[model samples]
Target chain A: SALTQPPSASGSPGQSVTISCTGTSSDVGGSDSVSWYQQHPGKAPKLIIYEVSQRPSGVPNRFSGSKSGNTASLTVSGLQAEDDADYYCSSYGGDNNLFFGGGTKVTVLGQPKAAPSVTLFPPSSEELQANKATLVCLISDFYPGAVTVAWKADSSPVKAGVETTTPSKQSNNKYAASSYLSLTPEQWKSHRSYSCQVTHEGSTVEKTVAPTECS
Target chain B: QSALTQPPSASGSPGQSVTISCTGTSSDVGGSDSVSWYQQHPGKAPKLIIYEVSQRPSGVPNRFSGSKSGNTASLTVSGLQAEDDADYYCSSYGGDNNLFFGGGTKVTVLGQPKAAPSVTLFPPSSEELQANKATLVCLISDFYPGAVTVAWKADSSPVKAGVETTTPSKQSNNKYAASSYLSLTPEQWKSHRSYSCQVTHEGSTVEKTVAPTEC
Candidate 1:
């Protein structure tokens, strides 16, 4: 019923997306073979999947990302709708990145599936950069009974930001929400990914990002 | 990852059945459980018709189906609907092309009534030489099916699909293939503009286009 994959994303053209970092005991952190990301539309693409936190050129730090022993993170400061697509976090071991998992599509889960509870997360204090963009994470459309939003940047919990649901058009038939985060150009250029995770019931879901210049 | 080979055309009358084959090397198709296929109408986009080789994506009618062989894979659309009267394409990230697909096949449904429709690749799959020279090639088997046309475009204008074209001699299995290389510089790949590789089977209105991917 639930498909599990690596948490990651690729920026569209010039914008960026995020990848949440996570895995089983054998993956992530330490020297475990773990890699994740989002792939943009085709155009002589260069595989930007990173080993740990290292990255390649043309890849900006605004895409700040971090990885713990069992989890990883991807945060993109600026936002672009065209950046929507399938995102995954994968674990690589004996095989290469090919031996990884599926991905979570950045799709709109229309109408609040359930009204579980609502909790507004506080925004980060990192000053926005003139050259770099900002990224935000919002949690909406809960089961009404127990909906809540948790804001965490580099892993540790943080104050929640704006948390509310609105009416809009998407698939499955309802309006949902997105989270947010801000990053300075320097911050954007330094990191490769970040995460805005949500917890419903005992299970959870997240989105990650990795930034790149479109042209 | 290895590459794949596919037949250009396979036809069946309404109320009848047809099966298109996708062949791959030991490294890709025959390598694992990730083989997938797509069905595309001439003017429309390529929709995922078959996934995991034999599994159908939800909402995809069962009339459109698939299967696999030792080193070859197949897509069979049975109880074919008139809407199925379009070109069919097969692909997989199994090898050389990483997310590789067959050149494309034209389907002409003969029936008392369904809908009279035509399919075509607006631009067509092509290639050129630039920053590094981006060349394009479309490989379709079954030369006996019909002749095909390949073209190229830049910005919004026409660019020759290739410098020198090479269509391999018809293979023993009645298949045809050709590889066109477009030498492109890094700059061309950056535009992320629209460019396509197309195939026009000689007798049928079947045409398919592979859009360009920004490098």
Candidate 2:
């Protein structure tokens, strides 16, 4: 059976957080192979804790691991900004079986959460060749990398031909992304307005691109 | 101002030769002997195959060679073997201390070509950023020689941005599996855009298209 872990955990910088992994007696409680791994975005996972509680060389002592009964716990003391990432736990079950816990997302709070600045780009005349139009919504200058995008036509929800990109971290460390909306040229002419709505940090910001703007 | 250019795929039968090319500007490929080539197998880290345009490191087989002419660098695999099926990448030092890399090429050493890959297209799951972005996944499985290239099209128009394809990795069944992803916005997906994932294997292409209504 797979080990169990919390889906997420959070702590501010300089604070500590502990994540737990629980398994059956044949795994966590019985094997010394319990290990903890840390992974950052777009990078490979690194082994931090091995043999239930031993830290690998080069790993800081601030990250500690321990086991109690069928539960394994990993604690990050004196949390830093770079400590925000996903952590996973693993154990070797007998009979050639291995178990891994559901990953836990550790969030380091206190980082500034900035709302995105949204821009809307209407389709060009050349894009009408195929009897369709494409609109672009650019969202930029956001922090914490959590945002949602929605499209609407004349205040009604648009459920078609919308594609939003994941928040991409820019060189300046802020986040940016673009959303595309596709529609037929006829629909573009008939619709009075099209809007791109971006929601971030519990608030919403929207921008509109209407055919009248072209005139 | 772009990275080096490379073909999406290359192939040769065992005992034959295949050459993959990396094309850059005079500022990069033609300007220096710092061009390097790397070989990467599925699920493994890349290994330096050729350095300084044509120099191979010790312990490398003589069958792999590199050369350059003008703005283009080439890697040739002579007497291709079953183990030669992998991805190849090239990089060169450019002006102003810039480094550029090719978009990688998949080299297939055909040995009694196996069955074509089965292609499946999956839409973005709700768990992915609450569906703010629509990520299309093309899964290619049960193929041999591990040579495959994936392309994305939106409404029959070619798409290049936000597309990522992985190297084919060996599966437990002894076959190979790979994946390609195309990221879109929810608006584009809901607009009934015809997004197709085309998988090219063994000289044949299999395509799977996904639309919001269908998924």
Candidate 3:
């Protein structure tokens, strides 16, 4: 079994953050291979390193990997603001299977902690009547690319009716995530206030829309 | 890229048993005890069958079992039924998320009425026989419904053990092949000696014999 990693780590731009993944002599430090992955918020993990220290094609060399004993490490150097994300380590272990370490969230320093911009697009009356309405919350211009997007109806918590995309990296080093809320005609018509909330760095920004008269 | 090694195909009739082997190395199967097995049907996601070498998840039949010895792990399906026909893959926890997967093995439902497999005995390489050592291969193929019994003999005497046989795995054309290996000392193999591979399926029996002259 592979040892788990730390909960989170942080470093400055032009600095580095090292994440550790430990396994037994039969795995990581053993003769087998090791790998690393990078995951932005709400997205699937992407492979970064394979076979101990080899980087996958198209992966920037700023991300490096190393191992000693039962522990393997992934270090991001010359950190760009976009490197502020989650990381994980993996090793091949007993009988052709793989083991994973707990994920480590990386916070790159020097990036402004800006609140996210949000917009809510409500469904039209025809869409509401169809009982299959899709509402989108367009979130953009958030720094660090680590933000939580949530939905609410009439100020109460909403557990369903939403699908959120992973934060998209923008050219200006900011981030964005979109949340889509689906609704039946009655559900959309009944809710007076529908809100899209974005949370980051202890601040919450929200945008809300109210149901329009169906007639 | 730590992939596990498995036979291409295996099969058994209802009421019979089948076992598949997953081979790795000291860095994997021999290093940790976190081996797992999965069963996948066409167009469906894999289902975990056995984990931690032998633990079956709830709802998995007790008929499925797993074990590991040295660098090799084994999964056995007992009381094989028509519904058991599918592909079986093995995985191991490498380090963190570095899991490795076996190429996979296909299980077939041998015909309900059963058909005996065709058998052939292939002699060792010419260099091996000339050097006084010998190797033999018993190749079984084309039996329907996947379950068959095979045995070996030297001069009408039973050859007990000292053989490595594979699970009956599916072939390119949907038939199956189960190969067994035998190693012999040079003094044991003579040009005048006779060796036989016997296959039994349902109530039918067939044998293939070979001599040094045939080699």
TM-score of predicted structure 3, chain A:
0.52
Select the stronger candidate by DockQ from 2 and 3.
2
lDDT of 1 by residue, B1-215 (tens): 22366666666777788887888776777877677675654322245677677887678987877887877888887776556766666655543324454556766666423221122111111212322434332233334433456555555566753332333322222233333333345456556565544445554443234344343
How does model 1 score by TM-score? 0.31
Off by over 4 Å in 3: A1-10, A14-85, A88-114, A170-174, B1-23, B36-50, B54-215
Scanning candidate 2 chain A in windows of ten residues, the lowest lDDT window is A123-132
TM-score of chain A of each: 0.38, 0.54, 0.52
Better of 2 and 3 by lDDT: 2
Could you report the DockQ of all the candidates, in the order they appear? 0.01, 0.03, 0.01
TM-score for candidate 2 = 0.34
lDDT of 3 at A46: 54
Per-model B-chain TM-score: 0.49, 0.54, 0.52
**Model 3 C-alpha lDDT per residue in residues B1-215, reported as the tens digit of each score:** 45689898998888889999999877777789989897865423346799899999778999999999998999999998766888888877665445566778888777654456756555544444555657666656666666677788887988886554554644433455565556677566674377788888777888877666531
Clashes of 1: 114
Error of 1 at A181 (Å): 41
